[PDB]
Structure 1
């Protein structure tokens, strides 16, 4: 399980904002599931230990 990443985790997390905004747009314009889960796991809460899992979950909705 390879998880290589760059030391400067300053601007790499910026794309996460765009990804979550895209997910929000999809769910709002294309409601497939309940929106409570998105509220449960909020990026600002910092409880996202593995961003890869969150990205997979977001893509899993695709």
Structure 2
């Protein structure tokens, strides 16, 4: 399980934000599942210690 990441984990998260925003847009216009799961896990909640899994879930809704 390769999870190489840059030393400065400061501006990479910005990209992540866009992803979730796009994801939000999807569920805003073409709903697929309940939005509750989005509410439970939030970028500002800090409970997400595995960003690659968040990206996997985001791609999953595709």
Tell me, yes or no, whether TM beats 0.5: yes
In the alignment, the residues of structure 2 paired with residue 54 and residue 5 of structure 1 have an alpha-carbon distance, to the nearest angstrom, of 15
Q: Which runs of 5+ in 2 are unaligned?
A: none
Counterpart in the other structure of 1:24: 24
Q: RCO (CA 8 Å, sep 6+): is it higher in 1 or 2? A: 2
1:51 Cα deviation after fit:
0.2
Question: What is the CA deviation profile of residues 6-34 of structure 1, one whole-angstrom value per residue up to 9, with x for unaligned ones?
Answer: 10001011001100000000011001111
Query: How far is 1:61 from its partner?
Result: 0.4
TM-score, normalised to structure 1, is: 0.96
Cα RMSD, aligned residues only: 0.5
TM-score, scaled to structure 2: 0.96
Could you tell me which runs of 5 or more consecutive residues in structure 1 were left unpaired when the two chains were aligned.
Answer: none
Runs of 4+, deviation exceeding 6 Å? none
